[PDB]
UniProtKB/Swiss-Prot annotation, chains A, B:
This is Lon protease homolog, mitochondrial. Changing W12P: Has normal basal, but low stimulated ATPase activity, and abolishes peptidase activity. It comes from Homo sapiens (Human). The chain holds residues 759 to 808 of 959 of the full protein. Belongs to the peptidase S16 family. Homohexamer. Organized in a ring with a central cavity. The ATP-binding and proteolytic domains (AP-domain) form a hexameric chamber, while the N-terminal domain is arranged as a trimer of dimers. DNA and RNA binding is stimulated by substrate and inhibited by ATP binding. Interacts with TWNK and mitochondrial DNA polymerase subunit POLG. ATP-dependent serine protease that mediates the selective degradation of misfolded, unassembled or oxidatively damaged polypeptides as well as certain short-lived regulatory proteins in the mitochondrial matrix. Endogenous substrates include mitochondrial steroidogenic acute regulatory (StAR) protein, DELE1, helicase Twinkle (TWNK) and the large ribosomal subunit protein MRPL32/bL32m. MRPL32/bL32m is protected from degradation by LONP1 when it is bound to a nucleic acid (RNA), but TWNK is not. May also have a chaperone function in the assembly of inner membrane protein complexes. The Lon N-terminal domains are crucial for the overall structure of the protein, maintaining it in a conformation allowing its proper functioning. The AP-domain (ATP-binding and proteolytic domains) has a closed-ring conformation in the presence of AMP-PNP and its N-terminal entry gate appears closed. Upon ADP binding, it switches to a lock-washer conformation and its N-terminal gate opens. It is found in: Mitochondrion matrix. Duodenum, heart, lung and liver, but not thymus. It is linked to CODAS syndrome: A rare syndrome characterized by the combination of cerebral, ocular, dental, auricular, and skeletal features. These include developmental delay, craniofacial anomalies, cataracts, ptosis, median nasal groove, delayed tooth eruption, hearing loss, short stature, delayed epiphyseal ossification, metaphyseal hip dysplasia, and vertebral coronal clefts.
Length: 50, 50
């Protein structure tokens, strides 16, 4: 069913190809300040090459 | 059609030359405060050499 925020993705791996999923999630409560103005920094993960 | 904020650009690459584009875009809502006085800091990207 792919609950919100997950998407399928094809990938041309070193052997064959595989239907790797990509996922995301909140990492803190949202309304820390109704006026809050701070960039919603992303934090990537999964053995990234630069 | 070159939608706003994109300009053509010649480049004397390592082999030949190619008409690579340069692109830009807003990264936050601008009117975070109608009175806001913060430097519109740029963020360059694309494997920059210093």
């Amino acid at each position: 069913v792919t609950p919100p925020g997950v998407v399928m993705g094809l990938a041309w791996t070193a052997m064959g190809g595989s239907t790797l999923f990509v996922e995301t999630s909140l990492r803190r409560p949202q309304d820390k300040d109704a006026k809050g103005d701070k960039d919603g920094s992303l934090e990537v993960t999964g053995q990234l090459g630069e």
